[PDB]
Ligand binder design. Sequence first.
Ligand SMILES: [Cu+2]
Length: 129
Amino acid sequence: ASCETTVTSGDTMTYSTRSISVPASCAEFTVNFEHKGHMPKTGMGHNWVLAKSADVGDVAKEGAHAGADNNFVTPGDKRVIAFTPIIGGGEKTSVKFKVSALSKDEAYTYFCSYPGHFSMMRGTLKLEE
Ligand SMILES: [Cu+2]
């Protein structure tokens, strides 16, 4: 469908894709996020969080202290452009954001903010005209 992608995860520290392109003719963009694990497992919860590449470390290290009830993202953090809740095996979620929040000229990284995952679990997002 036009302005959307699907990203999956499972019982590993990797997303299904390391690159996402957002068409600049979109007004809104939807990221569908699936966890293909079979059951909820310790240390295997995942989400999808978007920020400028320079902000990743700060957002994740601060977000870790937000707790599981806040989905490991600091409430109301302006560095976070969009995020999904933490999901476990068998679940799915979605986040829709405005394309006007993005800039060509800026560098973006999506990552998982479950404690410790952000180092390996990440990818690049680009606004493509
Ligand atoms: Cu994760």
